[PDB]
Amino acid sequence: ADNYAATRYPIILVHGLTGTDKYAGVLEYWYGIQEDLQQRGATVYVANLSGFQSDDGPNGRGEQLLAYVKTVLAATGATKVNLVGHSQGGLTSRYVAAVAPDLVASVTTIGTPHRGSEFADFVQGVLAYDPTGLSSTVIAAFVNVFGILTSSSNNTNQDALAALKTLTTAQAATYNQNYPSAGLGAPGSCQTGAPTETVGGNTHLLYSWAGTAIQPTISVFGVTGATDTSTIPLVDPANALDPSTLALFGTGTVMVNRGSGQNDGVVSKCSALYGQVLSTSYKWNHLDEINQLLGVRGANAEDPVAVIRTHANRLKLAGV
Ligand SMILES: [Ca+2]
DSSP, X not given: OOSTTOOSSOXXXXXXXTOOSEETTTEESSTTHHHHHHHTTOOEEEOOOOSSOOSSSTTSHHHHHHHHHHHHHHHHTOSOEEEEEETTHHHHHHHHHHHOGGGEEXXXXXXXXXXXXXXXXXXXXXXXXXXXXXXXXXXXXXXXHHHHHHSTTOOOOOOHHHHHHHTSHHHHHHHXXXXXXXXXXXXXSOOBOOSEEESSSOXXXXXXXXXXXXXXXXXXXXXXXXXXXXXXXXXXXXXHHOHHHHHHHHHHXXXXXXXXXXXXXXSBHHHHOOSEEEEEEXXXXXXXXXXXXXXXXXXXXXXXXXXXXXXXXXHHHHTO
């Protein structure tokens, strides 16, 4: 124990799609991360928002997080917070930073689809193929019940279709127009923006990193293969002990065939760029970024717990 991660302002971890603080009140979303940070002197709060919803609008995840932020401030006596989001959580964090600039000290996004996901486009394209539209309704009803049952508080505010739509590349472009940020580069440039933003007397430190385990390889007329760089080829035990490893490799192959380039299974390198990009070299798939499942990762993957701990220290040294 020490003060290595003792930031001035409390850290709030913000989960993405399907998330909650504890799956079924048992499995921590941010596996072993809250415990690690607290041990190093950090004050950390884990948000519990709708696993399936849009970020904007009444009852959206953005208004839920804003309300949680104010509750943490009142309880801590703190005046600002440091937001750290994973996946869609990064978009929710941007929402709070935009509507309540004075309550935010920094925004860090990990594997966040700032420009949307080619995979969401794919799933949405599939649904639209049913001429009767029944597929959408049935699947929606099933995913929605799933969210209520896995939510640690059995939150009934779930809308799988809104969530899907929010993650498409077309919708993300509109979100960016509605909630602009100095941390974003020009649409379609695959570039980041500025390292900070001054939102009316309030300065925010902006950071981001992405995992690029899935890399495109050779190809034929219309077929691009991929390789999972986080693992030792075929015999890595992570292929066996963590079911998400191969699952993201597969999802990642669909991504590459949709022109995404380097990705973590669901988010491309270009889509995740935001603020000061600390790294896009991590050999991680989407769940490795949050030390899942149960702390398993390929033999070539960096330690996500260490990375996050180091960032809490960088925040301390930066003055937040
Ligand atoms: Ca993993």
